């Protein structure tokens, strides 16, 4: 069923439907545009109207413009064909190498692993760094946090950990460029082609790239962390492989949330942050974990505003 | 019976409901697009920011106190854009692209949107060509590559702007020459400054014959906050013209601190939730999307580039503040300037410990790498020793005075390495610190006059060979002996 | 055109009009009052109604009381007849020496000199004082920050700069008393008469006083600098002189702007200051410059709050 755009303001867009109102999470395709603009339904305002969040720039949108319902959340490719490729927030390839051909298509939104599905292994991971291994060593299939201010050395540290651990590893790896420098994605991409972990000719790539960098709008940066997360979950659940997840920077997920929160019509929390800071991070973070079947090891770079850990 | 007037149908036009707090609420404009430019009855421009069900909130690019209620707003049709081309060179303009120098109309052919998204991963490629500032302390210690983003940051009156000015004056070497690849078109964006300061700035560039390859966007303190907010993006689009058409360009946002407070004004008047220092949540996104557009394009996409030099003003040297840390986490290196060094007379005052540029290091000449390889760490260790090792102080005082440089006088890369070679290799150890400045002037004027072949071989090869090293060794050695007594 | 008062909340006063809705910045004459009450229009609330800031006490105002539009901003007396006289924010004399018999009138609000009018050359203003000229010299069309209060010959220095600029450069001066003690205004007024820079007998006075002290409302105090500025703009633009504009002090201009912004209900900025801090200062300080016709050099006193320059 078609729907008309009633109001637009930044990333947030209100769409009205006559019949067949779409539920929360569902992606909506906007008509009369060159690039595929996807609106994700966040709230139900009432009077057959829904408040959405755009995954790309909303410039050019007019009131009364048509909006079709896909009938499901944002679906993306998942499988071995995603390895050695670069995906955006809504699943499209952004490396000029045709479509990503896959049988399965996972939705970016999903419930967290249940209590019975959780694992409890605590084997040490030898990184090679003296300060880490001695004082605060990482665990295999564990959640690793790299807190740091502006220009202290998180990207250097996470590249080292990829250089040390990801090369000496049997399973696959997944990098998620969340709201960081775009040239670093270019530096990383060509460096991985140089080393051999990403093979262009063969179908034996060990890394899957996902990018929604700081040039993208907030809606993209708010949902790209879930997109790259879903790619790693496929290998964990269906295949049962030991995955090495890498996010840089996970703060940009929460930072993007505050920008849209203002426009979503919520009462602001402490330091201008969104009131749903814990739950939005909770639903996202809880998915990143080692289940009984598979395993995910996440090294997350964390930005610290104004060198304030509080 | 005459037909009714349908000139003000609410489809393509609309009347103002209210106006006061920066925003203009407009009744009508049903077919208008989001972020579309709109024209008011008093010849004033505006942007359709808020599209609500019963009205359209418009950001007024200019004095909103001219607009009244019931005034007719009209659609331009296109998304907020600015004039673009080589016709802007040697012209001073406002954020909209209108000439303010009184030299007639621009006469531009092409136009580009202000809010275009930056190039993705594929069009980009690591920086290769060096962006020569012509400043010894910069080009040696903190070199900038073409396509790089390098933050100039420090307290008020520390010489932030002077680095950008000398960088623009230095490009005359390449632009008045045969090599089209080495040319660099400059764009100085002024945000929140005084008009007198900008008028003095363009005259200085005019006297140095630097304006004819320079565009000047001006949004001074008296101009409305939206014009200051827009000014960087307009100039950025003018830089992208060169970038996309296989040409290299430089852009200087002076400064993004004064842009941030302008955007904070708009957001606080919009009644949006404030955070750190009353700034909104998207002050990072404000500067991120701007700076990302500065990039190095590969040969497939023209092979051009856009180099960004954003400026930031810190209060009492607080680099850990909210806005500095945001711009530090965007750019590919920093150039921090200190009040202490600037007060002593060490100009340009650059903090060698804090200032870095790893991306620009790759795009540096091999000649400069040889003479200024160890110099980075030597100057850092020199500042540590506050209270064999005495020789470190004997070198540190010389290299600091050697890196000192006068204003409005850049140097060629081959001319710089010759001066740095003298101090770093240890041919100015037995000499008074005060004699270092006069030695440089006498030495530089000698080598540029007599030894052109030596300087030419250094530039052409981009390296100090064994024959050039031995030749250069015997100039500084014998010239010193005469200079001493 | 005539209007009617619809609301009164402190200094803020709403006025509804039938046909002619007055533009922003325009002065409105309130009818049926003993002394002259001026309202300056700030916003257009809609439905033929405008919000205004009072230049004096709003006591005695009734909902429905008539208000006339002057057709322009706060116009004031400007000319050689302002020299030796004291005037308030709205141009009325407050020295009990009869009316200010002026020839021309000038609005307090004015656009800053355009880019083409700017003087590209930086010339020095010879003060005649050795400490100033040598070490920290004054620039024509510049703005100098005077620091310190009593016990250091502050008023004597001010009177000398008035005398020396008038003696050497042939330029008159203006003293804008912004938000300080009315006691101090009385002290200076008589010291200037004692020195000779003001003369009550003949027309050889070198200063035009424009006072709006802390006894007056925030609406008045915010517009006093502009009133004194406009007096200085006459001698530059019409007579082609190197004018000397004193502001005592610039902090009170900033404080008044913060108070007016607060009373309107605008969400405050950092450290409780107004969102329009840079623009309010910018629009005033940019008018103080060198031009083709002349210049205005300004010596502005500064109170640094909490001894904090940041
Ligand atoms: N290398 C130098 N040698 C001597 N004087 C210099 C040098 N660089 C700058 N100056 C002088 O120092 C003053 C301040 O420099 P500049 O305006 O570039 O700093 P700034 O950080 O841009 O100041 P602001 O941010 O307040 O504009 C200038 O008036 C200039 O004349
Ligand atoms: N292991 C290291 N050794 C030396 N320098 C480092 C190291 N890690 C970081 N740095 C310095 O810190 C700078 C910024 O590093 P980066 O990882 O980009 O920080 P951030 O992730 O906070 O932006 C680099 O330019 C580099 O000079
Ligand atoms: Mg980083
Ligand atoms: Mg400056």
Structural features, described:
The structure is cut from a larger assembly and holds two copies of chain A (310 residues) and one copy of chain B (485 residues). Chain A has 310 residues and is an alpha/beta fold. Chain A folds into two domains: 1-73, Beta Barrel (Thrombin, subunit H); 74-310, 3-Layer(aba) Sandwich (Rossmann fold), CATH 3.40.50.300. In chain A, 25% of the residues lie in helices and 26% in strands. Chain A has six helices and 16 strands. In chain A, the strands form four sheets. Chain A has a six-stranded antiparallel β-barrel. In chain A, strands 8-14-13-15-16-12 form a six-stranded parallel β-sheet, sandwiched between helices. Chain A is globular and about 60 Å long. With 485 residues, chain B is of the alpha/beta class. Chain B has three domains: 9-78, Elongation Factor Tu (Ef-tu), domain 3 (Beta Barrel); 79-364, Rossmann fold; 365-485, Up-down Bundle (Lysin), CATH 1.20.150. Chain B is built from 17 helices and 18 strands. Chain B has helices at residues 136-141, 160-170, 172-175, 195-207, 225-244, 256-269, 283-292, 322-328, 339-344, 358-362, 366-371, 375-384, 390-403, 413-424, 435-449, 452-461, 466-484; strands spanning 13-19, 23-28, 36-39, 45-51, 56-61, 72-79, 81-84, 92-93, 110-113, 130-131, 144-145, 151-154, 185-191, 214-219, 248-254, 305-308, 311-313, 334-337. In chain B, the strands form five sheets. Chain B has a six-stranded antiparallel beta barrel. A five-stranded parallel β-sheet of chain B has the order 8-14-13-15-16, with helices on both faces. The termini of chain B are far apart. The chains are: A alpha/beta (310), B alpha/beta (485). Chains in contact: A-B, B-C. Chains A and B meet through strand 1, helix 3 and helix 5 of A and strand 4, helix 7 and helix 8 of B. Bound molecules: adenosine-5'-triphosphate, adenosine-5'-diphosphate (ADP) and magnesium ion (2 copies). Residues 156-162, 313, 347-348, 405-407 of chain B line the site of adenosine-5'-triphosphate.
């Amino acid at each position: 069923t078609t729907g008309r755009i009633v109001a637009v303001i930044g990333a947030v867009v209100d769409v009205q439907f006559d019949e067949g109102l779409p539920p929360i999470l569902n992606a909506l395709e906007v008509q009369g545009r060159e690039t595929r603009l996807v609106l994700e339904v966040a709230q139900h305002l009432g009077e057959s109207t829904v408040r959405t969040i755009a995954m790309d720039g909303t410039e050019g949108l007019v009131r009364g413009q048509k909006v079709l319902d896909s009938g499901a959340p944002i679906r993306i490719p998942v499988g071995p064909e995603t390895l050695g490729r670069i995906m955006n927030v809504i699943g499209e390839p952004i490396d000029e190498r045709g479509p990503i051909k896959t049988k399965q298509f996972a939705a970016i939104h999903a419930e967290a692993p249940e209590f019975v599905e959780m694992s409890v292994e605590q084997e040490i991971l030898v990184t090679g760094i003296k300060v880490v291994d001695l004082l605060a060593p990482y665990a295999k299939g564990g959640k690793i946090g790299l807190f740091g201010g502006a220009g202290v050395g998180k990207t250097v540290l996470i590249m080292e950990l990829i250089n040390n651990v990801a090369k000496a590893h049997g399973g696959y790896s997944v990098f998620a460029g969340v709201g960081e420098r775009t040239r670093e994605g270019n530096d990383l991409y060509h460096e991985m082609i140089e080393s051999g972990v990403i093979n262009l000719k063969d179908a034996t790539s060990k890394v899957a790239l996902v990018y929604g960098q700081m040039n993208e709008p907030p809606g993209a940066r708010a949902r790209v962390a879930l997109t790259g997360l879903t790619v790693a979950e496929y290998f964990r659940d269906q295949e049962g492989q030991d995955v090495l997840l890498f996010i840089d920077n996970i703060f940009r997920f929460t930072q993007a949330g505050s920008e849209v929160s203002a426009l979503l019509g919520r009462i602001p929390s402490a330091v201008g942050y969104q009131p749903t800071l814990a739950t939005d991070m909770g639903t996202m973070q809880e998915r990143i974990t080692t289940t009984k079947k598979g395993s995910i090891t996440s090294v997350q770079a964390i930005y610290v505003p104004a060198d304030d850990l509080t | 019976i005459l037909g009714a007037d349908t000139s003000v149908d609410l489809e393509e036009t609309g009347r103002v409901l209210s106006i006061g707090d920066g925003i203009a609420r407009v009744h009508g404009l049903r077919n208008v697009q989001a972020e579309e430019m709109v024209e008011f009855s008093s010849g004033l421009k505006g942007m359709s920011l808020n599209l609500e069900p019963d009205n359209v909130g418009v950001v007024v690019f200019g004095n909103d106190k001219l607009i009244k209620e019931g005034d007719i707003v009209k659609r331009t049709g296109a998304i907020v854009d600015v004039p673009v081309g080589e016709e802007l060179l040697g012209r001073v303009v406002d954020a909209l692209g209108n000439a303010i120098d009184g030299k007639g109309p621009i006469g531009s052919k092409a136009r580009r949107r202000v809010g275009l998204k930056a190039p993705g991963i594929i069009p980009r490629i690591s920086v290769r060509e060096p962006m020569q500032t012509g400043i010894k302390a910069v080009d040696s210690l903190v070199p900038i590559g073409r396509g790089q983003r390098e933050l100039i940051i420090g307290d008020r009156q520390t010489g932030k702007t002077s680095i950008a000015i000398d960088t623009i004056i230095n490009q005359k070497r390449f632009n008045d020459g045969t090599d089209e690849k080495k040319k660099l078109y400059c764009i100085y964006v002024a945000i929140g400054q005084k008009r007198s300061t900008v008028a003095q700035l363009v005259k200085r560039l005019t006297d140095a014959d630097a304006m004819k390859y320079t565009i000047v966007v001006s949004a001074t303190a008296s101009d409305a906050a939206p014009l200051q907010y827009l000014a960087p993006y307009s100039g950025c689009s003018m830089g992208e013209y060169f970038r996309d058409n296989g040409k290299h360009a430089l852009i200087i946002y002076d400064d993004l601190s004064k842009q941030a407070v302008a955007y904070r004004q708009m957001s606080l008047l919009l009644r949006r939730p404030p955070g750190r220092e009353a700034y909104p949540g998207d002050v990072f996104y404000l500067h991120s999307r701007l700076l990302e557009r500065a990039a190095k394009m590969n040969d497939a996409f023209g092979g051009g580039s856009l180099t960004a030099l954003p400026v930031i003003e810190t209060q009492a040297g607080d680099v850990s503040a909210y806005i500095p840390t945001n711009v530090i986490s965007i750019t590919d290196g920093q150039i921090f300037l200190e009040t202490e060094l600037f007060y002593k007379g060490i100009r340009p005052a650059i903090n060698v410990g804090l200032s870095v540029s790893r991306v620009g290091s790759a795009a540096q000449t091999r000649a400069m790498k040889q003479v200024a390889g160890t110099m980075k760490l030597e100057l850092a260790q020199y500042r540590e020793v506050a209270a064999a090792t005495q020789q470190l102080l004997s070198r540190g005082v010389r290299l600091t005075e050697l890196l000192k440089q006068g204003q409005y006088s850049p140097m060629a890369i081959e001319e710089q390495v010759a001066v740095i070679y003298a101090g770093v290799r240890g041919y100015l150890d037995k000499l008074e610190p005060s004699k270092i400045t006069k030695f440089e002037n006498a030495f530089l004027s000698h080598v540029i006059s007599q030894h052109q072949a030596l300087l030419g071989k250094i530039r052409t090869d981009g390296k100090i060979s064994e024959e050039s090293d031995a030749k250069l060794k015997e100039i500084v050695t014998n010239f010193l002996a005469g200079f001493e007594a």
